[PDB]
Design a protein around this ligand. Structure first.
Ligand SMILES: [K+]
Ligand SMILES: [K+]
Length: 871
DNA sequence: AGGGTGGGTAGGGTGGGTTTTTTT
């Protein structure tokens, strides 16, 4: 390199180094033998045969299977029964507590306004009594007017725990047990306490209603429908919302009630043709709001001397933030002392100063009155660092303080049941992410330490990468964290952002429609007889970017799920009949055909989110040791899940003590494992409803002849995805081998530490497959598994056979290639064509394989092909 | 689009080191 500047020299040696590296990887080129007398046999027959539902998802809509049919006798039974339940101590006390709520004074306006209108918006101002009292007001009103039999109410809750919890509280406030022929009940995936057939209040999640629309597009036998917590722009909540908006004309006798929370409720009101709204003031203790300047001024802190719509907005915001930065600082010198202001300009962004949180906790526990403390942090790292920072002091080491970390990965199953450790007078410091703000409630909070930021998900629409980064807390989220002071006593709130950022905060977070893929929603649109996909998405409130819809349509066209002409599904019927991701449905289809049902159902339930593992506090090395120990030599996270589920089944059949010892030993949660087992039950229910298996049992030997074989299971794993394949590269590294991965789309990627093949070196093959790509510090694959070249050769895609300066090379999707004799390559191409014919014919009309007539059963040949391989 | 057996008598603003919450 005679010339080139400094930075360019590394690009010169990087060009030569890239040349020698890529020519080395091409020099390897896997190996793919595929020799032996198999070639003799496979060719022969190759010429011969060439010349010659589930009734609404396992009755998850059992309450929907009704037709109202009111009668006066039942109305009289409800009226006299209400007169009898009036004389009851528990009922009287519950009614007094219900009188102590602000919504009780708003009973007449809500009841009358709901009865005289089809659409109604109720700005809740939580904490209030909207959710636990509006349905009781409606049902009690219908019962007290001789028309209680025709009343049938259904309310949608965004979270499962919120649905079942509100169901329990409402059932308790009526002096009744939940379900079992009583007034109030709930219904969620594979768990239901159904109420009465008439005059009943049923709580559920939105996915339950979307599951109902596949059997009743007009929602018969449903008098009143309620959408709660619509301020949280859950995707299903918006989709159902606009679907009901379209349903208003076809159903005049339907009453719809939306409930926001006194911020953008005027927007929801303006959506439904300027429908009237009703504001409930709610009840909350006073609470105080301290900001960063008030914190540093208070405790006298001395530091240690240290295309996305939101991203496009946060950039320019920073700009004007800079324009607002000096003057604000000047004003600060008119309000507070100079030291704390100098600390303010010395404060660092992109990182919440955990030392300030520690000193704050110390001052609160040492000088303020009794009460528990709740801390919000962006993620796991800050919780671990803050925990190690608090436990490093001798004052917190005593048994007079309780520190509880909260996280989805934290085994909160054992954290919900407690209170057997220490008496009162003990500080309950709960260091949590935003989970404590969304569902779990210890509810004994007096002090809230709101962290500055929170990790949020943003999907890229051009590079096809789901990203996640800690953004500034939304003003609604901060209002919730302030509302976390609860009805215990006057609390305190500590926001770790200056009063400048508080002026440049977005009113709300962006809806989930703009930050998640849209394949599931596209199939649900094309399956609910909603016509044009992009058109209905245009009807949807805040329509998504056009490029995202185009990309989702292209993706569904790649999988042969939608017609290239218009939205027509040749196989999207079977996929949409499955309540999971489309690639997961393809996975359970290929697993249902190949008679390896159970492991593919386990891997599918684990891949439809909800991974069965828990990591406690700060001991995660043992967690990775037990996980990698369960991996054995499979080099697969999914096969690790299979072995974990098998060990859990054997330990279950062994004894009850051995199950608890098993989950305790390998860091498992029997709740998640049980839920995934039920998910296997529902998957097998749908597969039997479609005709792929012979019985409901996922462990049926008719559909599990090959279930105990790693090769074909990994083959089904590669067949389920089809793309999302990554290349494994071998390097000399620091004199020793290291990991190098590529995806041909995002470029250089790496494996996330939560997997098993993080530091693995001994691989049988040089190809992996993944499901979740995430953009953080670098592109990470949260789950991956090795795949034999013969496996991906059967389900990869187009095949090209072109060689240069080497033996004949087979390329799937062009960029993956490996050398082998051509006379075998073309044979594999023809056998691939016949395989595609039999797969399509098997897809349009499914039925068991019925081995072994050998007339339409040549798949044992391919199974034997995959069973034979080499390094 | 990358390495230390390119070198550091080019430089480090060129770039090479971590786990969020949810439902069907
Ligand atoms: K260098
Ligand atoms: K260099």
């Amino acid at each position: 390199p005679g010339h080139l500047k400094g930075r360019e020299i590394g690009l010169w040696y990087a060009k030569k180094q890239g040349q020698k590296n890529k020519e080395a990887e091409r020099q390897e080129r896997a190996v793919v033998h595929m020799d032996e007398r198999r070639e003799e046999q496979i060719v022969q027959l190759l010429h011969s045969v060439q010349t010659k539902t589930e009734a609404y998802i396992d009755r998850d809509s059992e309450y929907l299977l009704q037709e109202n049919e009111p009668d006066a006798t039942l109305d009289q039974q409800l009226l006299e029964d209400l007169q009898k339940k009036k004389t009851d101590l528990r009922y009287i006390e519950m009614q007094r507590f219900r009188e102590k709520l602000p919504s009780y004074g708003m009973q007449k306006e809500l009841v009358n306004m709901i009865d005289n209108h089809q659409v109604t918006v109720i700005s809740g101002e939580t904490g209030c009594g909207k959710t636990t009292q509006v349905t009781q007001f409606i049902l009690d009103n219908y019962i007290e007017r001789g028309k209680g039999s025709a009343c049938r109410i259904v309310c949608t809750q965004p979270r499962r725990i919120s649905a079942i919890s509100v169901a329990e509280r409402v059932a308790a406030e009526r002096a009744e047990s939940c379900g079992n022929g009583n007034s109030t009940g709930y219904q969620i995936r594979l768990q239901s306490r159904l109420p009465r057939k008439q005059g009943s209040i049923l709580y559920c999640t939105t996915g339950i209603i979307l599951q109902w629309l596949q059997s009743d597009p007009h929602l018969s036998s449903v008098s009143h429908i309620v959408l709660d917590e619509i301020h949280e722009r859950n995707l299903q909540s918006d989709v159902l919302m606009t679907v009901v908006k379209d349903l208003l004309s076809y159903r005049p006798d339907l009453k719809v009630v939306l409930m926001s929370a006194t911020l953008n409720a005027e927007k929801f009101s303006e959506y439904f043709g300027n429908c009237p709204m009703i504001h409930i003031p709610g009840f909350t203790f006073p609470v105080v709001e301290y900001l960063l300047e008030d914190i540093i001024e208070k405790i006298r802190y001395v530091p240690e001397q240290k295309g996305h719509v939101n991203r496009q907005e946060k950039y320019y915001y920073e700009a004007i933030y800079k324009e607002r930065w000096p003057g604000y600082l000047r004003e600060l010198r008119q309000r507070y002392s100079a030291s704390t202001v100098d600390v303010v300009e010395m404060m660092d962004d992109e990182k919440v100063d955990l030392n300030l949180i520690a000193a704050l906790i110390r001052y609160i526990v040492l000088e303020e009155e009794d009460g528990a403390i709740l801390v919000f942090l962006p993620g796991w790292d800050n919780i671990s660092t803050l925990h190690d920072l608090l436990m490093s002091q001798v004052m917190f080491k005593s048994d007079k303080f309780i520190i509880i970390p909260l996280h989805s990965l934290m085994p909160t199953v054992n954290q919900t049941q407690v209170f057997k450790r220490t008496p009162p007078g003990v500080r309950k410091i709960v260091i949590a992410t935003n989970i404590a703000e969304t569902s779990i409630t210890i509810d004994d909070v007096v002090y809230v330490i709101d962290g500055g930021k929170i990790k949020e998900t943003h999907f890229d629409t051009q590079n096809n990468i789901s990203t996640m980064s800690a953004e500034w807390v939304s003003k609604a989220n901060a209002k919730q964290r302030k509302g976390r002071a609860g009805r215990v006593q006057p609390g305190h709130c500590y926001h770790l952002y200056n009063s400048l950022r508080a002026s440049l905060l977005d009113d709300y977070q962006l809806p989930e429609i703009l930050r998640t893929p849209l394949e599931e929603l596209c199939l649900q649109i094309k399956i609910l007889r909603l016509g044009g996909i992009a058109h209905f998405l245009s009807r949807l409130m805040d329509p998504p970017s056009n490029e995202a819809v185009l990309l989702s349509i292209k993706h569904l066209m790649e999988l042969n799920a939608l017609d290239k002409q218009e939205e027509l599904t040749p196989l999207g019927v079977h996929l949409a009949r499955l309540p999971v991701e489309p690639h997961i449905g393809k996975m359970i289809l290929f697993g249902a055909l190949f008679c390896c049902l159970d492991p593919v159902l386990t891997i599918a339930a684990s891949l439809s989110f909800k991974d069965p593992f828990v990591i406690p506090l700060g001991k995660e090395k043992v967690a990775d040791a037990r996980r990698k120990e369960l991996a054995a030599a499979t080099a697969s996270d999914h096969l690790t899940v299979v072995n974990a589920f098998k060990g859990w089944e054997k330990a279950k059949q062994r004894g009850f003590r051995y199950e608890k010892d098993y989950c305790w030993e390998y860091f498992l949660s029997s709740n998640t494992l049980q839920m995934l087992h039920n998910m296997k039950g529902q998957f097998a229910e749908h597969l039997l409803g479609a005709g792929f298996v012979s019985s409901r049992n996922p462990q049926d030997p008719e559909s599990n002849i090959n279930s105990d074989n790693e090769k074909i299971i990994k083959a089904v794993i590669c067949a389920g995805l089809y793309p999302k394949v990554a290349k494994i590269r071998l390097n000399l590294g620091k004199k020793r081998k290291m990991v190098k991965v590529y995806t041909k789309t995002d470029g250089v990627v790496a494996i996330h530490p939560k997997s098993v093949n993080v530091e693995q070196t001994e691989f049988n093959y040089n190809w992996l497959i993944y499901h979740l790509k995430m953009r953080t510090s670098s592109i990470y694959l949260y789950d991956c598994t090795e795949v034999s070249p013969y496996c991906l050769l059967f389900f990869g895609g187009d095949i090209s056979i072109q060689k240069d300066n080497d033996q004949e090379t087979i390329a799937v999707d062009e960029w993956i290639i490996f050398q082998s004799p051509a006379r075998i390559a073309h044979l594999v191409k023809e056998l691939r064509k016949e395989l595609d014919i039999l797969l399509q014919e098997k897809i349009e009309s499914p039925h068991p394989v019925d081995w072994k007539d050998t007339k339409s059963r040549d798949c044992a040949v391919l199974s034997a092909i995959i069973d034979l391989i080499k390094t």
